[PDB]
Design a protein around this ligand. Sequence first.
Ligand SMILES: Cc1cc2nc3c(=O)[nH]c(=O)nc-3n(C[C@H](O)[C@H](O)[C@H](O)COP(=O)(O)OP(=O)(O)OC[C@H]3O[C@@H](n4cnc5c(N)ncnc54)[C@H](O)[C@@H]3O)c2cc1C
Ligand SMILES: Cc1cc2nc3c(=O)[nH]c(=O)nc-3n(C[C@H](O)[C@H](O)[C@H](O)COP(=O)(O)OP(=O)(O)OC[C@H]3O[C@@H](n4cnc5c(N)ncnc54)[C@H](O)[C@@H]3O)c2cc1C
Ligand SMILES: Nc1ncnc2c1ncn2[C@@H]1O[C@H](COP(=O)(O)OP(=O)(O)O)[C@@H](O)[C@H]1O
Ligand SMILES: Nc1ncnc2c1ncn2[C@@H]1O[C@H](COP(=O)(O)OP(=O)(O)O)[C@@H](O)[C@H]1O
Lengths: 449, 451
Amino acid sequence: MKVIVVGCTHAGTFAVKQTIADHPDADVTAYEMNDNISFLSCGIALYLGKEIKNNDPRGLFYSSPEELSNLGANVQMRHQVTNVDPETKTIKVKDLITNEEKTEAYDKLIMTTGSKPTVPPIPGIDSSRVYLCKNYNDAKKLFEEAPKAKTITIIGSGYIGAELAEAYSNQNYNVNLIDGHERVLYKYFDKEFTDILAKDYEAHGVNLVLGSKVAAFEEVDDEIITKTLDGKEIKSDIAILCIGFRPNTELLKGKVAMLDNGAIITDEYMHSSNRDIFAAGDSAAVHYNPTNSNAYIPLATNAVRQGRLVGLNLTEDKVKDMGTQSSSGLKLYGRTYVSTGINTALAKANNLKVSEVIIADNYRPEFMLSTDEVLMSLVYDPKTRVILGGALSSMHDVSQSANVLSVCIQNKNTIDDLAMVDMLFQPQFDRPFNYLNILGQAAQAQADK
Amino acid sequence: MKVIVVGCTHAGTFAVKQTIADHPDADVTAYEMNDNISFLSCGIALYLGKEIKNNDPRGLFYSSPEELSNLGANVQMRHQVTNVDPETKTIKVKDLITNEEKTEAYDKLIMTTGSKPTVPPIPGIDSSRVYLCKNYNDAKKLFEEAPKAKTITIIGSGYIGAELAEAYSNQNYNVNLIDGHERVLYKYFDKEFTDILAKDYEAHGVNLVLGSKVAAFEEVDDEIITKTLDGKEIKSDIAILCIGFRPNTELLKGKVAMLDNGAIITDEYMHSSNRDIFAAGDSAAVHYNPTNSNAYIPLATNAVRQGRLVGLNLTEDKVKDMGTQSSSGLKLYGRTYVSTGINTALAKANNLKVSEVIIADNYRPEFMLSTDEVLMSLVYDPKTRVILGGALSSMHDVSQSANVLSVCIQNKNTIDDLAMVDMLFQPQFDRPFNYLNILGQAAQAQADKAH
Ligand SMILES: Cc1cc2nc3c(=O)[nH]c(=O)nc-3n(C[C@H](O)[C@H](O)[C@H](O)COP(=O)(O)OP(=O)(O)OC[C@H]3O[C@@H](n4cnc5c(N)ncnc54)[C@H](O)[C@@H]3O)c2cc1C
Ligand SMILES: Cc1cc2nc3c(=O)[nH]c(=O)nc-3n(C[C@H](O)[C@H](O)[C@H](O)COP(=O)(O)OP(=O)(O)OC[C@H]3O[C@@H](n4cnc5c(N)ncnc54)[C@H](O)[C@@H]3O)c2cc1C
Ligand SMILES: Nc1ncnc2c1ncn2[C@@H]1O[C@H](COP(=O)(O)OP(=O)(O)O)[C@@H](O)[C@H]1O
Ligand SMILES: Nc1ncnc2c1ncn2[C@@H]1O[C@H](COP(=O)(O)OP(=O)(O)O)[C@@H](O)[C@H]1O
């Protein structure tokens, strides 16, 4: 059977490998419009920060055309799919070097076209001093342009802009970080967490320009100035846009069911509204467990799992999607910040009524020769007491705790469950009750009044 | 109503505090045979290893007679409960300073009498150069007296013995570690984990004397010679016995339902077979989730949980025990070793049929400036694919991953759930799939091939 995979980074690479693994009757073709596949975008900030082995971006690839071709896939780089017609099971594809366009049939189509960076329709985006940050070629451009810059402006303080700002400030660039929200990582963490980060930014010489969106760029002399709606004008050698992503799904607009942003809605086996077209990764919606609904959560975690499920379910509905909790994290200036599920910002934006407790405790006993404060939040349903989300931050790497809370959320466990569930004690690791147990107990006490 | 707590370390302290917080009409008396309460025995190896603040063991106490008295408890230290008579609801109590005995009534009795050290009738075990290691007074004695020794022998390589060998090996004593098993931590971790620990012991000068039990001790001059069955004679200045514990439960032998070893069987609200006598901690059996049955898992985690449940359930059946998974861990020479649930050694002892996979992966990508291998095992039920246990070890602190597996066991999650459940990705922490996901995927691959 003929299987065509459109796009080959995280989701497409996994879909190809799992398909070939489980269906030796599959003749697979991958179309990718870039001149590369299988590049780890999630390593870009460490690469630009000069914090990967030998500063060598070859180590950020987890596959290659030769590897996939030896599995037996027909890998066609610099090829752009320009049409999909679900009713006839055909696509049109353009060779980008020769401009030659061909229509071809498929038995199954896998839409792993991901997302593109959001580029706001404002003056100056065409400047050679404005940089995107999504893919290998973007990364290479930034890494090569670094020696010619001493001042960088980063627009957008989501996960990517937060990491870049840290990465450039640790190399003694002058850094400006600009966002329309009044806090960094506004949608991602409570104020008690982002206040800590802001303090660290200012201690490392980062100029935080918060509360007004960028309205324009203007290239003048060997610099660009970034201009906010409220009148500020910020000069740098270069500027980097980090204001999010949108599903790359124009090919299927009006043809399969989608969220308002274009994310392809799928059943539990990764089929779109058309049975022979699968979607996975940043092209697709996820089943979000905390609100039992479809959501857009463009993370590599979802790309690899969705890609895997496409391969598993290619011919048969064999393995249901477990859904996801938006588990994510970062480490900035040595401090870990992790979260899973819902937070109070996202609850307010969606008119959900939730409860939350915020507590701080040393992760292990004070009699130890060292310990560190862990700041913790737990978000739960006031009526069912089911856990809906949580977040932790410490100088100690508490990241694996977000995975504990993710499993709680997956099983719809309550604050009462978390309060008492067995967790190991040894003073090198924790107090007799683990800090997650203590968090649950604090939520219980709040709920009981 | 009159509440009597017998024994006051982990379980008894939690029981007293929770009881008083939830039951203003409880009139609590606490009897403790020792001259101290509320000491953290789980801190002794760090104290003895000079790895706590100011090497001050007062920092290991989580309560005090003054604190419990201010809450309204009548704290009676150096008092031993010598009899419990359910038929009259009375106990007998000896004052250990004066030898006087008095009888009193109870409405509720809370048996938090814990465990006592196993001491077999091995000849010479009585010697003044043989030390126990259970409580504050044992620890204080070792802290005072070990510096006089050049060579320390540790008998028993379970959790305590292993910790003590590490602690003393880092202060440049000669250390012998003796055990009847062929591997350190035999009961607790697979060989793949314990081979690593053994070489670390050896590289820090610890002499491992494995495979033969101690048969006799002999005191000669100012030394003690420990003699194994196989003919080895191990000379040292002192010996420390770390060969386990048993329930301290003679007061109720023949009076309430127990396991063969004396552990008091309770219902989900911590009642013994006698409605007005509760049990919590090392005196009690746990509800062990992996086998869905009663077991003896003497850990602080169970003591604090069971003590809390006694206080919550003192007058009304309010909160059910969720049971436990035997989650435990050590950090030895900077390496984390953690476990939850069943292991293959334990299954093989109880005739349980399980499957297990063991894999090793770097915890985070190889392009990072550094990463560390994490060695991992997962035990699961071949018929239901349900997770029954797991273990991890790494130079990176992967301890909280054992708690992820604990929560999976709690919920009877399968290897297939573990393979795909959402866990975060950032290259500072892990690969796109977390090492635990990778573990579940390995278990899936094994289970699928074997049919
Ligand atoms: C800088 C950065 C840091 C990130 N950090 C993290 C992190 O730490 N953890 C985490 O979990 N996630 C992180 N993310 C998100 C994560 O990288 C994405 O969710 C993931 O890359 C999505 O993978 P994908 O395969 O769905 O899509 P994409 O990576 O978007 O790849 C889609 C591919 O499809 C190709 N394509 C598109 N249209 C066509 C067409 N018409 N014809 C042919 N080919 C086409 C594109 O060229 C591209 O190669 C980060 C993202 C970025 C940009
Ligand atoms: C050295 C060591 C290290 C350990 N490490 C860990 C670890 O890292 N993590 C973990 O989870 N667990 C660990 N444990 C186990 C943990 O300490 C025990 O599970 C816990 O102490 C048991 O608490 P308890 O209150 O049940 O009993 P116990 O601490 O044994 O206390 C019972 C009390 O009852 C008193 N008593 C007994 N009989 C009478 C009587 N008749 N009258 C009056 N008083 C009486 C005793 O004097 C004692 O004070 C360790 C144990 C030791 C000894
Ligand atoms: N025009 C703009 N000027 C400044 N900030 C903007 C602008 N447009 C969007 N943003 C900000 O960019 C961020 C969007 O990034 P986000 O998608 O949430 O994270 P990430 O890009 O790392 O996935 C938000 O904090 C938002 O306020
Ligand atoms: N006579 C003996 N000689 C040497 N080792 C012994 C002897 N008796 C018991 N042991 C060992 O003592 C160890 C006790 O450890 P265990 O009870 O399982 O953990 P813990 O440190 O909590 O006490 C066991 O490995 C057992 O082999």
